[PDB]
From a paper:
report the characterization of 4 highly potent NAbs: F4, F6, F7, and F9. The structures of these 5 complexes are almost indistinguishable. that these NAbs prevent HAV attachment to the permissive 2BS cell surface. binds to the BC loop of VP2 and the BC loop of VP3.
of HAV by F4, F6, F7, F9, and R10. regions of light chains and heavy chains of F4, F6, F7, F9, and R10.
Author numbering:
A (entry chain D): 1 to 213
B (entry chain A): 3 to 29, 40 to 93
C (entry chain A): 94 to 272
D (entry chain C): 51 to 246
E (entry chain B): 5 to 56
F (entry chain E): 1 to 135, 140 to 221
G (entry chain B), I (entry chain B): 57 to 220
H (entry chain A): 187 to 272
Write the structure that this text describes.
């Protein structure tokens, strides 16, 4: 009945540094468990009571704490820890879990890749339009792509389909899709997605046109 | 035993209070032709840790040469602080 | 329980042996309690108790007798006309009764065996030779009357004259079967 | 019939893995003379205990039971176990007992390491009725008639520590022996394999 | 003071000429006895060195 | 190895019913009590059901108290969750869970794959797939626009899945009563537009298979 | 574990007819409750073997009249006679002489030990029936209290359990 | 078991031994314990060679106490609405 | 009330430095818990007077090396020396010889009886510190268990309370 | 019976003496027989002394009815290894007669 929250929400940490999250109860709790939701699978044997790991869990981790606030202190950051954890109590009737800390890999800054395409000729026969800006192979995930549509700024209908960080090259990906009506699509010309990268002082303008070709 | 906790070995009296009066006095050889049994021992067992310490063939240092005694609290903390 | 049998025609002499083997599955062998009991111990040497019960039609003549192993006898567990005669059957030892007077016989089964002791659990050719110790066989007469069944029963129990030897592991759960 | 009963005969089998948690229940045992589960594929046979065949020919039974848990570890395994005795009947929700709640019930601690394997654990007669019936002849459950005077739980009191050049499991055998045993009112019943 | 005795390691057993000494030994259990035959199925002496 | 494989789920209109199940192997479930753990798509799990070794002790929380029903069978070694009075708050992913016993609390060891129950009532919609073509470099990310399908499981396949180094399968986004994604592939200039790059979009629930190839317009 | 425990509090009134059963309870089950110290000994120990001590105290005003009955019944009042209850070890009540009686009965049960989690039948059943009607005039109070003080005697404990 | 014939004697006087795992049975009970903590025996008969020309075949069963049993805790007798006959 | 009760389960690892306190607990408070049979005697009786029996069992594999310490501390580890802990009645641990020790200490407390509802200070505090670091090579397991079996000795009970 | 395991293995064996045959005897109830167990922890030498268990008194070598004794050895616990520990261990049975009688000499071989 009492609520378990987690103070780190989204954390990005470099390989080889100290990582520590916190499941902060709002009451006195005895033993607060933890889990690991890998991207695509279910959580398994990860952490029991406070400092008792599983048998298949790596022995590089640490857990401690007394009373209310408990901490799962990581001593050695690696590449296989890009997953979301939970935290659980076992003392009431309604067992509610934690909020979820999405810990990912902080890789160095990489430029975004833009292949912005028109909608299909089949979608204009369907009366619709989806102006999609392809955005792949980049750090960080935190990017604010605004649309420069004939000098305007329209954040409505911006469909953002998010994959997570890729498990091979440690890069993020972004779909930036603008759903438009056919008469809405056939009114503008400039169709510009621009990147907000922490190294890119000027936004990289890679656009296309409707009247072109 | 009043409680009922039985064991296969016997626990002896460990850490005996006041083992020695600190006057150096007589109360031949301490070690010598008799072999030192307390030279090697086992310290994890407190039963065999009760063995007399020696490693060298010795004899008595002798009687001390101050009449008063300075190894009890009744005559050490008697001087005020 | 040991066995039970019926009758079909006139003077159909029945012959059943007692085989202590566990290979002989019931009804042609050992039923429920005696199958487990005759495989708990290795060797057996001593007599048994036999209580037969006659139930059914009336005015039927009968005769029961003993025949040891290693002699000429009729076919086991098959009801047919006896090839034996009254001189061979009565010289071995027999009783004479009628199915209207008492209808039941409690009789001993004495140890007529040339070997030392019989053993229950065996395999090979020695199982059909070093296990059997007795044979109870019945011939009937004055059959039949108006249509009514004629069933005989055969029970066994141990006597206080026998002994037991070398305690054996009991029968598994796939062998303790009943008729 | 004492010659077959008190001789220790194998009734069950459970290993002690290292991938388990502290206090996790491994195997629950209905404590009775009617206990057997092992079998064999070649030949077609279901392995019986010498105690169960003696007692399957009776309506009632009364007497103590002695389990013998023999381990086969290496000399380098360790950890401990807890052999708690949870009384009652064969039908409760026994798998909800906390490990510290099992400390109220009678029990016995045991070290895995050492040069003595078999701990002869004896079962007292904890019962409400003096005569305990063979209910397995019937096929309908009924409160009042029981067959088990208690239930054994081998807890994971500690985990398994081991070197690298051996396996990660220690097998524990379950013998079955009895003392002060008494049975009357005979019957005939071929018992079935208890698959727990 | 209680003491649990263990198995002896050294053992000198065997036959007349065949002689074996083991480092890993166990207690040789023995049940029953050599039984004689009162109703003799052989009325003469057994095979021996003196008669053969 | 333990496989607590779920079975069931699907599309039930709000006000309907469903009976879930979870197959079990590598151990006897007759000891350990089992549990259904529900995964909301906003990453908020919920502990909704647990019944013990026998079918007597049920531990129901405040939410599902009076809505659902858990059941077990110790001989068949499966699970049962008879649900009723469904609504949009229970439109979520389900998981069978094994509960084991620790020294002062309890603990979950092994979980399953997961069955999808979407409690909503639009019609079943097959997906509509549109290629994406430019109006350059040695790396051109293409794509197909899989638009307009309500049942969530769908699979876009790129040349029998052979282009998987650059396949960026973007997840579905619910928009205008339609889950819509835009599957994308990264195909170099030597292969495209010289060879075949075709998205095989397969949908198991509505039983449709769509093949679309990106050609430059 | 052997001290007088109040198990029930009723009130015998004037409007009750003849042979009306005032109290109907289980002596063993009411002693099985969280609010007593005998819960502390019986919670870990399943089996039970005990004798039953009974003391019942009532308080009438001496301007009333009537009498009660207090019998100890094994099992149930299935087909026992109301008029033949004095064969049982009983104790009567009177508005003339006394107000305290005591009854000591042994363990009457089909078995030897007792199971708390699933009893076959109640061991003892204390009954209180109206032996004579309670009459009043004008001004005399129309209520009088009733209390049952019960305790165990000669308790045994066998076979500890881990469950509660 | 026993074995007889309906022409020889036609009557059997037989004991009823105490085969019970519980301590003692009790007559007057209610609930689920009345069908469990009261019964102590069962007499059952199988027949054969039936039938012949049309004639009834009725068996009787009587009981009497033996000198090996005892009695406990004198109870109030049955009321007048329970003393019924067949 | 006098039987060995497991109170804590930790695991001594290889990554612990020198003089790191493995266990820090109260022996009296962990015996005050619902999951034990000593709850049944101490729930009605407030006052307590008891001696402390300690047995600690660990299980190392013989391809490791290192040692531990197990001292019994009255009150707290406020300013006691880590290197002078052997003056206390202790028991050491070794990967060479033994794995079972026992310690019997008396009731060391400023008063005579004990109050469960509001203690002034903890009576005993069992300490376990790293006496030698646990080293491994390649393939030797990097964990070894630890368990504390504690029980009361010479218990008195005085002054029953009605509250829980 | 003498066996020789290396102490980096684990497992156990059984050695029972069976009269006649293993026809319907229980595998789990073999300890009623005079047996001797084996262990990778403690010992490697056991001995069993059993008497002549046979339906008759004397024995015929040319045509036996059934075998008198049948020494059985079954796997009581599985033999597990890791990496590098040897995957074999030997087994030997040393048997001899006790209390022999000889009667009735024959001319044939």
């Amino acid at each position: 009945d009492i609520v378990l929250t987690q103070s780190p929400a989204i954390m990005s940490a470099s390989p080889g540094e100290k990582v520590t999250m916190t499941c902060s109860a709002t009451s006195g709790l005895s033993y607060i468990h933890w889990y690991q939701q890998k991207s695509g699978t279910s959580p398994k044997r990860w952490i029991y009571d406070t400092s008792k790991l599983a048998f298949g869990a790596p022995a590089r981790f640490s857990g401690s704490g007394s009373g209310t606030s408990y901490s799962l202190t990581i001593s050695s950051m690696e590449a296989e820890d890009a997953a979301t954890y939970y935290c659980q109590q076992w003392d009431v009737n309604p067992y509610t879990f934690g909020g979820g800390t999405k810990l990912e890999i902080k890789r160095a800054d990489a430029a975004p890749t833009v292949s912005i395409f028109p909608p299909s000729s089949e979608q204009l026969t369907s009366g619709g339009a989806s102006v999609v800006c392809f955005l792949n192979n980049f750090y960080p995930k935190d990017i604010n792509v605004k649309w420069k549509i004939d000098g305007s700024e329209r954040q409505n209908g911006v469909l953002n389909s998010w994959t997570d960080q890729d498990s091979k090259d440690s890069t993020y990906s972004m779909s930036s899709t603008l759903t438009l009506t056919k008469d809405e699509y056939e009114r503008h010309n400039s169709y510009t997605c621009e990147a907000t990268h922490k190294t890119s002082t000027s936004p990289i303008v890679k656009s296309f046109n409707r009247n072109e070709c | 035993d009043d409680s009922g906790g039985f064991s296969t070995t016997v626990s002896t009296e460990q850490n005996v209070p006041d083992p020695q009066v600190g006057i150096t006095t007589m109360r031949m050889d301490v070690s010598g032709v008799q072999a030192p049994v307390g030279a090697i021992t086992t310290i994890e067992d407190p039963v065999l840790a009760k063995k007399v310490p020696e490693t060298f063939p010795e004899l008595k240092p002798g009687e001390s040469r101050h009449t008063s005694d300075h190894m009890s609290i009744y005559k050490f903390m008697g001087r005020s602080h | 329980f040991l066995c039970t049998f019926t009758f079909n025609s006139n003077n159909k002499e029945y012959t059943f042996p007692i085989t202590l083997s566990s290979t002989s599955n019931p009804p042609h062998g050992l039923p429920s309690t005696l199958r487990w009991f005759f495989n708990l111990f290795q060797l057996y040497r001593g007599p048994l108790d036999l209580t037969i019960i006659i139930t059914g039609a009336t005015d039927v003549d009968g005769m029961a007798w003993f025949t040891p192993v290693g002699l000429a006898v009729d076919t086991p567990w098959v009801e047919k006309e006896s090839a034996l005669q009254i001189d061979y059957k009565t010289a071995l030892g027999a009783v004479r009764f009628n199915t209207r007077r008492t209808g039941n016989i409690q009789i001993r089964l004495p140890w007529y065996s040339y070997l030392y002791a019989v053993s229950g659990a065996l395999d090979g050719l020695g199982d059909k030779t070093d296990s059997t110790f007795g044979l109870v066989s019945i011939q009937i007469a004055n059959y039949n009357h108006s249509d009514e069944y004629l069933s005989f029963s055969c029970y066994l129990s141990v006597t206080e004259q026998s002994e037991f030897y070398f305690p054996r592991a009991p029968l598994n759960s796939n062998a303790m079967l009943s008729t | 019939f004492t010659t077959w009963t008190s001789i220790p005969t194998l009734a069950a089998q459970f290993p002690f893995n290292a991938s388990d948690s502290v206090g996790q229940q491994i195997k629950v045992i209905p404590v009775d003379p009617y206990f057997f589960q092992m079998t064999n594929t070649n030949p077609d046979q279901k392995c019986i205990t010498a105690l169960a065949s003696i007692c399957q020919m009776f309506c009632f039974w009364r007497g103590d039971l002695v389990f013998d848990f023999q381990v086969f570890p290496t000399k380098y395994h360790s950890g401990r176990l807890l052999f708690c005795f949870v009384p009652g009947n064969e039908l409760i929700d026994v798998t909800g007992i906390t490990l510290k709640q099992a400390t109220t019930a009678p029990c016995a601690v045991m070290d895995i390491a050492g040069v003595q394997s078999t701990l002869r654990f004896r079962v007292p007669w904890i019962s409400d009725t003096p005569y305990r019936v063979n209910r397995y002849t019937k096929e309908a459950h009924q409160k009042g008639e029981y067959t088990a005077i208690g239930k054994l739980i081998v807890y994971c009191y500690n985990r398994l520590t081991s070197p690298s050049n051996v396996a990660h499991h220690v097998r524990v055998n379950v013998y079955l022996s009895a003392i002060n045993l008494e049975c009357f009112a005979p019957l005939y019943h071929a018992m079935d394999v208890t698959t727990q | 003071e209680q003491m649990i005795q263990s198995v002896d390691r050294t053992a000198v057993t065997g036959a007349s000429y065949f002689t074996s000494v083991d480092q890993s030994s166990v207690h040789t259990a023995e049940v029953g006895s050599h039984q004689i035959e009162p109703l003799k199925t052989s009325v003469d002496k057994p095979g021996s060195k003196k008669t053969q | 190895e333990v496989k607590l494989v779920e079975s069931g789920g699907g599309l039930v209109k709000p006000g309907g019913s469903l009976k879930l199940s979870c197959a079990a192997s590598a151990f006897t479930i007759t000891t350990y009590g089992m549990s259904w753990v529900r995964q909301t798509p906003e990453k908020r799990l919920e502990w909704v059901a647990t019944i013990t070794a026998g079918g007597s002790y049920t531990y129901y929380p405040d939410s599902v108290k009076g809505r659902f029903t858990i059941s077990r069978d110790n001989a068949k070694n499966t699970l049962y969750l008879q649900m009723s009075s469904l609504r949009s708050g229970d439109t979520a992913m389900y998981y069978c869970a094994r509960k084991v016993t620790s020294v002062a609390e309890y603990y979950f060891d092994y979980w399953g794959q997961g069955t999808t129950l979407t409690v909503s009532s639009p019609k079943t919609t097959p997906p509509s797939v549109y290629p994406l073509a430019p109006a350059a470099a040695s790396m051109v990310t293409l794509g197909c626009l899989v638009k307009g399908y309500f049942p969530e499981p769908v699979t876009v396949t790129w040349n029998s899945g052979s282009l998987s180094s650059g396949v960026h399968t973007f997840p579905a986004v619910l928009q205008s009563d339609l889950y819509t994604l835009s599957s994308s592939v990264t195909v170099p200039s030597s292969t495209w537009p010289s060879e075949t790059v075709t998205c095989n979009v397969a949908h198991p629930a509505s039983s449709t298979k769509v093949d679309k190839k990106i050609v430059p317009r | 574990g052997e001290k007088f425990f109040l198990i029930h509090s009723a009130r015998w009134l004037t409007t009750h007819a003849l042979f009306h059963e005032v109290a109907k309870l289980d002596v063993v089950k009411l002693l099985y409750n969280e609010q007593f110290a005998v819960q502390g000994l019986l919670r870990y120990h399943t089996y039970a073997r005990f004798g039953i001590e009974i003391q019942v105290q009532i308080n009438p005003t001496p301007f009333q009249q009537g009498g009660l009955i207090c019998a100890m019944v094994p099992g149930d009042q299935s087909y026992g006679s109301i008029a033949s209850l004095t064969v049982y070890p009983h104790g009567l009540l009177n508005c003339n002489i006394n107000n305290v009686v005591r009854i000591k009965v042994p363990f009457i049960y089909t078995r030897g030990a007792y199971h708390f989690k699933d009893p076959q039948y109640p061991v003892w059943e204390l009954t209180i029936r109206v032996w004579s009607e309670l009459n009043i005039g004008t001004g005399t109070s129309a209520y009088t209290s009733l209390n049952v003080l019960a305790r165990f005697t000669d308790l045994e404990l066998h076979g500890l359990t881990p469950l509660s």
